[PDB]
Design a protein around this ligand. Structure first.
Ligand SMILES: CC(C)(C)NC(=O)[C@@H]1C[C@@H]2CCCC[C@@H]2CN1C[C@@H](O)[C@H](Cc1ccccc1)NC(=O)[C@H](CC(N)=O)NC(=O)c1ccc2ccccc2n1
Lengths: 99, 99
């Protein structure tokens, strides 16, 4: 598919058995998902953005479906206003920027 | 060009006649550049992201060259950690996401 940038590039994702809306984000190194009760072991992490840092939980080898395309990798969970799909997962679904 | 996402999508820009490095960022609504002297009129504004809100100078109708392509639009100047090119200027140069 091709997505224009007139509006935020939001798509449907599936994670932990739940459907959510998330932003395809070429400026994010990491994938950050809103607070949810994911099972299993995690490691403490701090991540930065414009504004400063927030505390998150790092989960490894998490399955996520992005606009119908399957991926598996690291997902950070904590208090974000928007679910963001970063480059660690955009590469797995074959995404590029074109102009 | 077609840009893949295994590395950060960094390009050269020209702004106020000066060369800088900046990130092509589909997750950003706006364009935010590090503190600099810039010819043009400005007004105070506040913007947010992952760790909270910061104070910036808003400059309208600024000429900027992005990887060899011309844009003329709004640039925010302030204590951002990384120079970011957001959707207000990505749309001007014809950029799309593809997968
Ligand atoms: C630029 C502005 C217009 C303020 N927009 C945004 O900030 C929106 C805000 C939205 C709501 C809050 C949740 C984030 C989304 C997406 N972001 C865009 C989004 O693309 C944003 C832009 C950015 C990049 C680099 C440095 C600063 C800011 N990325 C991020 O916040 C990601 C988060 C992450 N850890 O993956 N940061 C980075 O990937 C990153 C990279 C280098 C750094 C160097 C020093 C300090 C911090 C650094 N952070």
């Amino acid at each position: 598919p091709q997505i224009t940038l007139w509006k935020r590039p939001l798509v449907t994702i599936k994670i932990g058995g739940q459907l959510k809306e998330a932003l395809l984000d070429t400026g994010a190194d990491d994938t950050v998902i809103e607070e949810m009760s994911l099972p299993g072991r995690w490691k403490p992490k701090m991540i930065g953005g414009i504004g400063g840092f927030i505390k998150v939980r790092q989960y490894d080898q998490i399955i996520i479906e992005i606009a119908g395309h399957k991926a598996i990798g690291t997902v950070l969970v904590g208090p974000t206003p928007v679910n963001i799909i970063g480059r660690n997962l955009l590469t797995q679904i074959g995404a590029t920027l074109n102009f």
